[PDB]
Amino acid sequence: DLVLTQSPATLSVTPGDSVSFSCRASQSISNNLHWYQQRTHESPRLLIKYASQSISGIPSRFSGSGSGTDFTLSISSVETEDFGMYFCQQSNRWPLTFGAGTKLELKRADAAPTVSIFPPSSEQLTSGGASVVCFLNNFYPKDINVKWKIDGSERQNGVLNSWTDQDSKDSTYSMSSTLTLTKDEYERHNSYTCEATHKTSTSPIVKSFNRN
Amino acid sequence: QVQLQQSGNELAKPGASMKMSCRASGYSFTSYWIHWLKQRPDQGLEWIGYIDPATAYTESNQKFKDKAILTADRSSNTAFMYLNSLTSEDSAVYYCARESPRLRRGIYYYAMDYWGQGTTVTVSSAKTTPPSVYPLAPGSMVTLGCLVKGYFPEPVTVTWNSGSLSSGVHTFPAVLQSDLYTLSSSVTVPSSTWPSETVTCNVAHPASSTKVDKKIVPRDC
Numbered sequence: 001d002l003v004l005t006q007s008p009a010t011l012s013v014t015p016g017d018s019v020s021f022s023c024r025a026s027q028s029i030s031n032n033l034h035w036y037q038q039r040t041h042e043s044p045r046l047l048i049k050y051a052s053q054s055i056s057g058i059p060s061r062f063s064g065s066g067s068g069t070d071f072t073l074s075i076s077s078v079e080t081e082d083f084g085m086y087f088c089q090q091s092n093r094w095p096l097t098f099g100a101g102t103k104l105e106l107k108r109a110d111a112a113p114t115v116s117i118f119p120p121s122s123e124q125l126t127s128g129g130a131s132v133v134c135f136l137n138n139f140y141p142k143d144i145n146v147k148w149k150i151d152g153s154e155r156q157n158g159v160l161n162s163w164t165d166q167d168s169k170d171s172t173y174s175m176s177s178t179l180t181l182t183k184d185e186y187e188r189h190n191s192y193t194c195e196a197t198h199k200t201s202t203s204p205i206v207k208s209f210n211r212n
Numbered sequence: 213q214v215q216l217q218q219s220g221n222e223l224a225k226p227g228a229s230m231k232m233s234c235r236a237s238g239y240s241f242t243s244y245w246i247h248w249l250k251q252r253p254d255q256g257l258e259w260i261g262y263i264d265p266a267t268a269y270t271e272s273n274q275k276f277k278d279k280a281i282l283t284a285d286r287s288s289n290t291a292f293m294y295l296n297s298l299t300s301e302d303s304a305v306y307y308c309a310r311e312s313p314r315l316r317r318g319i320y321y322y323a324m325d326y327w328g329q330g331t332t333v334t335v336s337s338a339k340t341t342p343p344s345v346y347p348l349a350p351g352s353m354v355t356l357g358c359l360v361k362g363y364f365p366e367p368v369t370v371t372w373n374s375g376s377l378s379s380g381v382h383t384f385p386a387v388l389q390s391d392l393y394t395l396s397s398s399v400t401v402p403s404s405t406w407p408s409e410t411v412t413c414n415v416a417h418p419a420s421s422t423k424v425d426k427k428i429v430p431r432d433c
Contacts, residue, residue: 017253032322034321034323042325043327043328043329044257044307044309044327046323046324048314050323051322078392085255094273095273096259097259098257101255114353116350120351121346121347121348123347124359127344131346131359133348133360135355135398137355139383162396163385164382164383174384175384176384176396
């Protein structure tokens with residue numbers, strides 16, 4: 001029952017900045033704590049062991065400190081190859097456990113999502129299926145909530161959501177949400193709505209259509 | 213020049229059993245423990261256990277005691293891990309990693325210094341099913357789409373106009389549901405080029421050896 005808590009889950013920054021990730025233990029684990037870095041498409045890589053001992057070729061900007069129940073990993077002057085996920089691991093007792101991670105992403109100006117909704121295509125209805133798709137493209141920050149409404153009501157099931165990773169060119173995120181129905185259900189109702197809430201608007205961002 | 217090479221990705225039907233491999237090279241295979249970790253889609257890392265090749269001694273996470281079995285083979289410089297009763301929750305990427313040099317005799321860091329590339333595993337009872345490609349037509353810029361539904365297994369290769377259209381494209385990662393995959397892709401073009409000029413998405417699913425072209429035509433209703 002030794003829980004490791006990493007905060008914050010996401011750290012949005014610009015190259016040249018300094019950051020410090022926190023990793024807290026629910027019990028004193030002395031200095032038995034290591035840090036790992038995981039860039040996309042790569043496996044984890046050991047950065048620091050025993051809270052503060054840096055590994056062979058680890059750039060000097062990576063510095064770990066801490067003891068007992070509080071540990072901190074700092075990066076002074078973040079470079080672009082430092083973007084990724086960072087995990088802490090306790091080695092105090094069994095089983096060995098990791099924190100949930102902290103993602104370091106590239107900051108940029110807020111951007112409202114461009115939303116598009118598409119009714120089912122005839123080609124799919126004829127097969128007895130009904131998939132309504134909603135694209136939410138190029139927004140920032142990452143946090144976004146999408147809700148589906150059928151005739152002013154909420155549908156929790158049959159919803160498939162997928163997100164792209166931060167774009168290399170403009171650094172925004174994108175998402176698509178599909179609500180999959182029955183050619184039947186789809187025909188009992190008339191109004192279909194894609195509803196989103198994002199930092200860029202205090203009121204819901206909505207896109208809708210009636211099958212008329 | 214230390215290196216850990218894991219077996220290739222794999223599909224498996226539920227209830228089945230599986231055995232992955234981790235071949236070592238670059239250092240004395242018997243001098244170091246080999247750990248096994250699982251990384252779940254939400255990125256969460258779990259420690260499964262470790263094997264000491266020099267002893268065959270094993271230490272495992274209480275959570276995978278009767279689910280995972282570790283063994284090694286000195287003759288082949290390879291560690292193995294057997295997963296039993298493969299359910300859906302067992303779909304994830306699995307890693308083997310080396311324990312770093314000891315502090316002193318019998319005293320370790322429990323810090324992994326060299327990792328394998330990872331071996332993905334998907335537990336689905338589906339057959340190599342080609343996908344159904346549906347066009348997404350709207351009802352200054354215009355956004356069109358293609359829904360690639362019900363395929364297996366990954367991957368699919370979506371392109372727009374055979375590649376002539378590369379700008380303003382977003383292809384979402386595939387999501388598995390009901391043992392079947394579903395992907396979608398969007399493209400945004402100037403409203404002064406559609407429907408005037410033709411736009412079509414080309415979907416290629418190698419596993420079925422099926423290639424498909426779907427033209428995006430405006431819905432007249």
